[PDB]
């Protein structure tokens, strides 16, 4: 089967947009493809972090991913730093990547402009990221359009390493999510729903309680026409709301439009709020079940064990080519 | 006891100057201090390397170090890449070192000027080097004046990490070698004897055969006075030759001057050639004994095992502070 690698940034806050956009699709894909879910804690260490926080988010994220439906026996869920091969492979690749390729990275030139002095990690994470992917012969890397540029570099590195030392790495491919379900901001229909929006009213968290989901959905911006009709550009807000409703309820946008014929927004919002709360309630339950169960570490252990089992052998072949050790 | 860490670049070629300068002196220090001899193969990978070569020099260097007299039970001799903690610690430090501190490194600005595109490794090795040292709580780092600047950075990093996360690393100190001699080039009395001299006639290798040592010593530059008298600046060549003779034979420079009263350079060179060949013959023998002896890998194995035993525990405490993993 093909292999899919997905890095997860430890922040214990994944939006309903993430869940609708790719996360949920993964709960299904995990049976056909060979999924690798890696909680990249070494990448998260490139910016100031609170030791207690970071450590807490790693558990949350792993717990929340299991809660959403990731099967620890069907897929591999592990913490990056518990697999040393990542740091080892990261170093070797840093030796074949040119300084230019790094300083030209637009994700680099972005944060390297607004500061006096940044961690060298903000300029050297590409080689590490490339390693995360290449270490598992991954074929598909589900990424956003803002990261495509990153997959490009990791592709180049692989190919360059293959020609110089012989075919070993699998040139990965960046596959984008099923198109349409791009959930927009609840306060800015044009802007996308981001976990890092300055306004918490712009997104809904898988952990948001009923009261908040109701408060946030009730504030969702709409328009002045007052009719539940889908239309990207004139009725941005309502269309976004209709999208969220449709994908979480199963009913098409046609059925929903009809179902809310003479209906106003008051009742639409009210109903949408329930379908969201009803979808997250189970997830939230399972989440706490995992958070306070020691079976969590058991899963993370066996995960790091399966990831390492592969990564190690890959790093060993790398060292072989490079000519390190014996 | 105090701990001394020393990195060894794999190049299977250590000059008679290195042997006289420090190598022969570690063989003694290894009993009082706690010596760590690390064959930095990951550092050697920052420049183009031949897989077969690099792998061969790692064995040679380890074998040649044992031959000189390093006691594998009194000291720790290991290959860097066989201790993963080095790559792991290297990454964490890269996150606390500023880009400026790296780009300002004069050993960086040197090789970053004469090329179109250099490996990012040539700019990111400092954090790795700092890790090599800091991982063993080393107290003294025997380095040349050209590397002092490097020990400075690793000192800063340690202190910075200690304040931010709590006392953990031991601020190392760069101690300069005993020597007091300084073996100069056989072709340029003013220049120092370097393993990387463009002229192989400028140095003598611990592996140079009798025929070569005789050919190289017979070409050693002298002067026109034709009298064996020590004098730094007027008689540079002969003084250098007298120094090499004295330290390898045990006789003072006074005794040698006297011993070669009316004697010309012909016989001086002839005698110096024997004392050198007689000193290297045993070393070379023991070297081959180790090279083809499988007891070599046995030593490198137990070495990596003792280095890892320490490094691991150190990296674990690092991760603790940083907040990585569990």
UniProtKB/Swiss-Prot annotation, chains A, B:
It is an enzyme of class 6 (ligase). Its EC number is 6.1.1.2. It is found in: Cytoplasm. Inhibited by indolmycin, a competitive inhibitor for tryptophan. The keyword DNA-binding does not apply. One of its GO terms (biological process) is tryptophanyl-tRNA aminoacylation. It catalyses: tRNA(Trp) + L-tryptophan + ATP = L-tryptophyl-tRNA(Trp) + AMP + diphosphate + H(+). A motif ('HIGH' region) lies at residues 10-18. InterPro entries: aa-tRNA-synth_I_CS (IPR001412), aa-tRNA-synth_Ic (IPR002305), Rossmann-like_a/b/a_fold (IPR014729), Trp-tRNA-ligase (IPR002306), Trp-tRNA-ligase_bac-type (IPR024109), Trp-tRNA_synthetase (IPR050203). GO terms for molecular function: ATP binding; tryptophan-tRNA ligase activity. NCBIfam families: trpS (TIGR00233). Catalyzes the attachment of tryptophan to tRNA(Trp). Homodimer. This is Tryptophan--tRNA ligase.
């Amino acid at each position: 089967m093909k292999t899919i690698f997905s890095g997860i940034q430890p922040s214990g806050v994944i939006t309903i947009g993430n869940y609708i956009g790719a996360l949920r699709q993964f709960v299904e894909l995990q049976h056909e493809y060979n999924c690798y879910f890696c909680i990249v804690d070494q990448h998260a260490i490139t910016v100031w972090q609170d030791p207690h926080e970071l450590r807490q988010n790693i558990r949350r994220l792993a717990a929340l991913y299991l809660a959403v439906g990731i099967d620890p026996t069907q897929a591999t869920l592990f913490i990056q730093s518990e697999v040393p091969a990542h740091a080892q492979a990261a170093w070797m690749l840093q030796c074949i990547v040119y300084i230019g390729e790094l300083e030209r990275m637009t994700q680099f030139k972005e944060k390297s402009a607004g500061a006096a002095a940044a961690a060298a990690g903000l300029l050297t994470y590409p080689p590490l990221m490339a390693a995360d992917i290449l270490l598992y012969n991954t074929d598909i890397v589900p990424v956003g359009e803002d990261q495509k540029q990153h997959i490009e570099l990791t592709r180049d590195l692989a190919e360059r390493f293959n020609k110089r030392y012989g075919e070993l790495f699998t040139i990965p491919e960046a596959r984008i999510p099923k198109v349409g379900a791009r959930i927009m901001s609840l306060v800015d229909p044009t802007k996308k729903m981001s976990k890092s929006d300055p306004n918490p009213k712009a997104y809904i968290t898988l952990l948001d309680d009923a009261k908040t989901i109701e408060k946030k959905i009730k504030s969702a911006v709409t328009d002045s026409e007052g009719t539940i009709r889908y239309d990207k550009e004139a009725k941005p807000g309502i269309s976004n709301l209709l999208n969220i409703y449709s994908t979480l309820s199963g009913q098409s946008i046609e059925e929903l439009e009809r179902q809310y014929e003479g209906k106003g927004y008051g009742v639409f919002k009210a109903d949408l709020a329930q379908v969201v709360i009803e979808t997250l309630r189970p997830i939230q339950e399972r989440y706490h079940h995992w958070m306070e169960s020691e079976e969590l570490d058991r899963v993370l252990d066996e995960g790091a064990e399966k990831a390492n089992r592969v990564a190690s052998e890959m790093v060993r072949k790398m060292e072989q080519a490079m000519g390190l050790g014996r």
